[PDB]
Amino acid sequence: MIPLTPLFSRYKDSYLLYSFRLIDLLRASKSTHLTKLLSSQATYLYHFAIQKYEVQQLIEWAINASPDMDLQQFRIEFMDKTTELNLRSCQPKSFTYTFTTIWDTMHFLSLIIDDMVYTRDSLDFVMQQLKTMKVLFYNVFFILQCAMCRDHYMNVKGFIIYHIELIEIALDKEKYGTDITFVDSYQQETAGADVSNNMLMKNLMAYVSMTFHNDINDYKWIQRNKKPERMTWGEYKKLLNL
Amino acid sequence: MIPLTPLFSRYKDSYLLYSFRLIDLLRASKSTHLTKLLSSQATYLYHFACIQKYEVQQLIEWAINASPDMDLQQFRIEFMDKTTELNLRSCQPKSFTYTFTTIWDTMHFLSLIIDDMVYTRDKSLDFVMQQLKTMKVLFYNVFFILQCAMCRDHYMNVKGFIIYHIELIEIALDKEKYGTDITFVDSYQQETAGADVVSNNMLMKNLMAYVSMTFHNDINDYKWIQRNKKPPYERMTWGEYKKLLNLQ
Numbered sequence: 001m002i003p004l005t006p007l008f009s010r011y012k013d014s015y016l017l018y019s020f021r022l023i024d025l026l027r028a029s030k031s032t033h034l035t036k037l038l039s040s041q042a043t044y045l046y047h048f049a050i051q052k053y054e055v056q057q058l059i060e061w062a063i064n065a066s067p068d069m070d071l072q073q074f075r076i077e078f079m080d081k082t083t084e085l086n087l088r089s090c091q092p093k094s095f096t097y098t099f100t101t102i103w104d105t106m107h108f109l110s111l112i113i114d115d116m117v118y119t120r121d122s123l124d125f126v127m128q129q130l131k132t133m134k135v136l137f138y139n140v141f142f143i144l145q146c147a148m149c150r151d152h153y154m155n156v157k158g159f160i161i162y163h164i165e166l167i168e169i170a171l172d173k174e175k176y177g178t179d180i181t182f183v184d185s186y187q188q189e190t191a192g193a194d195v196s197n198n199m200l201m202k203n204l205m206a207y208v209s210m211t212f213h214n215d216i217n218d219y220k221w222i223q224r225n226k227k228p229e230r231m232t233w234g235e236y237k238k239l240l241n242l
Numbered sequence: 243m244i245p246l247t248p249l250f251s252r253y254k255d256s257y258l259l260y261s262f263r264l265i266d267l268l269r270a271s272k273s274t275h276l277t278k279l280l281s282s283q284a285t286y287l288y289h290f291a292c293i294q295k296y297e298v299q300q301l302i303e304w305a306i307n308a309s310p311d312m313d314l315q316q317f318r319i320e321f322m323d324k325t326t327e328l329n330l331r332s333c334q335p336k337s338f339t340y341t342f343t344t345i346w347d348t349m350h351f352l353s354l355i356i357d358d359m360v361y362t363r364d365k366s367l368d369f370v371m372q373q374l375k376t377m378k379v380l381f382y383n384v385f386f387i388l389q390c391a392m393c394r395d396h397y398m399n400v401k402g403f404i405i406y407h408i409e410l411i412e413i414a415l416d417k418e419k420y421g422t423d424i425t426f427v428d429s430y431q432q433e434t435a436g437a438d439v440v441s442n443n444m445l446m447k448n449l450m451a452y453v454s455m456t457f458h459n460d461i462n463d464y465k466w467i468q469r470n471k472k473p474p475y476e477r478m479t480w481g482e483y484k485k486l487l488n489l490q
């Protein structure tokens with residue numbers, strides 16, 4: 001499926017760390033609503049990482065874990081519990097949690113979307129996975145503390161979700177007889193809509209999340225009142241072997 | 243300022259109707275947060291329409307104190323008197339039939355306003371940058387007023403597509419503030435391609451008109467997914483849209 005590269009290996013570990021830090025919040029949840037949101041998100045996260053059954057036991061354990069433990073103690077009991085559930089594949093290699101962990105996670109999910117679409121057949125299955133992807137991007141938690149970031153993301157996250165919906169639309173047209181034409185550039189996709197073609201950019205969500213990532217970093221100069229090395233699509237594809 | 247066309251004339255009247263129906267909601271607000279949100283949005287809405295600021299404050303304060311036991315038709319009559327008394331006849335909608343078109347018209351109207359502020363900007367770039375932040379607040383908090391929970395949930399999910407492009411304009415104005423003038427281009431594709439290069443400051447002419455138009459099409463495309471229906475079907479094209487609004 002997705003090319004194995006150094007950068008993808010980091011994405012994968014960051015993804016697991018993100019998921020670990022999410023289930024640690026369950027014991028602390030101050031509402032039923034938050035508990036249901038976290039539980040579903042973490043279940044979805046491991047889904048994209050028998051396995052469904054073991055994950056359910058892991059999440060249920062996380063739900064009942066003592067609220068009076070610290071993170072470091074939760075981490076100990078989590079490494080034991082994942083080992084006992086034969087879920088060693090859920091254990092992160094590193095636990096240093098930063099903005100990069102969150103970015104890696106979003107870029108990881110984007111790669112998963114692109115891969116599911118490229119290797120589809122079952123279009124109902126992929127259309128259901130996409131809806132789950134929309135829920136995941138809608139409900140990204142920062143876990144770390146940055147209110148400004150949370151405010152900014154809640155304003156512009158629809159940019160990513162919108163593009164997931166474009167893929168749904170493409171798959172719907174394919175179900176009804178117009179196959180997907182994969183194109184090399186975003187410009188072919190956006191221009192093609194301005195008219196019975198069904199053109200979709202290859203690696204669309206890699207590009208979408210890369211451009212979104214650049215925009216966030218450009219905007220923070222406005223946020224700090226300061227004068228401004230941005231990632232290019234050419235070098236991003238190279239780093240990930242796309 | 244914006245070209246005068248039949249379609250723009252509708253947009254402006256729809257915009258007034260939308261603003262009227264919004265201030266009708268203050269008397270029934272079930273929470274001080276909703277009250278604060280509604281009153282600021284209505285004040286922002288009339289700010290982008292056109293001492294007007296002070297009379298609008300008086301109109302909004304009247305709406306806050308109006309009886310919650312009135313019905314909409316009675317609110318409408320008192321509103322028509324209050325706007326007359328305050329020398330605000332220009333706030334009065336010509337038509338009161340409220341539909342989805344009313345909401346779309348309002349969103350398209352605001353997009354045209356954004357594009358026009360950028361074009362006429364004083365190169366007081368802080369002023370237009372401040373106005374854009376107000377527009378982001380307006381699109382974030384769009385009220386349907388009519389009943390469509392599915393529409394509300396959908397908009398909540400994808401409204402950031404519009405707001406994102408307002409932030410692209412802010413970034414371009416920030417660059418111009420600091421020495422790199424905006425280069426205007428004729429197509430969205432030119433803008434997105436130039437964003438991937440150096441240091442260009444490329445912005446599409448009439449970007450928000452194109453963005454809101456494209457968003458409008460995507461919503462209508464997606465609804466066929468929501469209905470499990472196959473699309474029947476003439477979508478709106480950017481060429482045809484520029485013609486209707488006499489955009490150059």
Ligand SMILES: Cc1cc2nc3c(=O)[nH]c(=O)nc-3n(C[C@H](O)[C@H](O)[C@H](O)COP(=O)(O)OP(=O)(O)OC[C@H]3O[C@@H](n4cnc5c(N)ncnc54)[C@H](O)[C@@H]3O)c2cc1C
Pocket residue numbers: 099100102103107148149150152153209210211212213214216217220223231236
């Ligand atoms: C959803 C989200 C919203 C955020 N909102 C804000 C905000 O509003 N204000 C604020 O100050 N900070 C915000 N941040 C944090 C900010 O984006 C940076 O992560 C932070 O400022 C650290 O900057 P950095 O350059 O050291 O790390 P980053 O450059 O952001 O990321 C580090 C890693 O990601 C790589 N990378 C860099 N750019 C890209 C790209 N376009 N595409 C793919 N990979 C890339 C880098 O090469 C590096 O390997 C947000 C972060 C996220 C995940």
Ligand SMILES: Cc1cc2nc3c(=O)[nH]c(=O)nc-3n(C[C@H](O)[C@H](O)[C@H](O)COP(=O)(O)OP(=O)(O)OC[C@H]3O[C@@H](n4cnc5c(N)ncnc54)[C@H](O)[C@@H]3O)c2cc1C
Pocket residue numbers: 342343345346350392393394396397454455456457458459461462465468478
């Ligand atoms: C923010 C918002 C979100 C919505 N979400 C949903 C949803 O999730 N599910 C659902 O079923 N309905 C949704 N709707 C309503 C839906 O978009 C239509 O308005 C409704 O279904 C009526 O369809 P229509 O084509 O006959 O009228 P409309 O699409 O409302 O068109 C009304 C006017 O706008 C013109 N127009 C048409 N297309 C465009 C365009 N691309 N750009 C500019 N002008 C155009 C038309 O010529 C017409 O004059 C939403 C509406 C809004 C404003």
